[PDB]
């Protein structure tokens, strides 16, 4: 019907270690694409401080407290019967001196 595509691409975030960090994207396609997030080649699962809030086309990755073990490249993968779309963003986590 119509493959996935990004109305709004996910942007890099630079955050102080221990503070909140979020990636946001807006995904279109028909039927509405299912979105999952990947890091290190593996699909991320929800946890105590990682969740994946979504409101319609708007899909997000939320770290309630971002630690250095969370830094790196996150991939947003959107999927429906017509295709798949991929976009990445760097989360940078800054440790105080």
């Amino acid at each position: 019907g119509s493959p996935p595509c990004f109305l709004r691409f996910p942007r890099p975030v630079r955050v102080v270690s221990g503070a909140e960090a979020e990636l946001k994207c807006v995904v279109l396609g028909e039927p509405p694409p299912v979105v999952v997030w990947e890091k290190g080649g593996q699909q991320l699962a929800a946890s105590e401080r990682l969740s994946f809030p979504a409101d319609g086309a708007e899909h997000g990755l939320l770290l309630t407290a971002a630690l250095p073990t969370d830094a790196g490249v996150y991939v947003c993968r959107a999927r429906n019967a017509a295709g798949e779309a991929y976009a990445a963003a760097a989360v940078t986590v800054l440790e105080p001196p």
Partner: protein, 98 residues
């Protein structure tokens, strides 16, 4: 005003797509003047032809590669490379066909 060398922001390491489907991969970048974008697979440039399956759309800070009706022979290691008057950058993503 000052030049900025091109810098590719996040590009995925590996992506997968089912045969016969559309694949899209978007990638942000910076650099001043606006960098020229080249997509290539196995060292060979991808040509965005309006009468074909490969299409490339470039803005000031974004490139999108769309492959329609993905064939098993479309798989391989794709390189995004950027160039302006102040330097270059490249990143590779491994595109897998299921």
């Amino acid at each position: 005003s000052r030049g900025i060398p091109p810098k590719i922001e996040a590009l995925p390491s590996d992506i997968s797509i089912d045969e016969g489907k559309v694949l899209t991969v978007a990638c942000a970048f910076t650099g001043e003047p606006t960098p020229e974008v080249t997509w290539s697979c196995g060292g060979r440039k991808i040509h965005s032809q309006e009468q074909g399956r490969f299409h490339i759309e470039n803005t000031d800070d974004l490139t999108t590669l769309i492959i329609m009706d993905v064939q098993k022979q479309d798989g391989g290691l794709y390189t995004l490379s950027l160039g302006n008057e102040f330097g270059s950058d490249s990143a590779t993503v491994n595109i897998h066909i299921r």
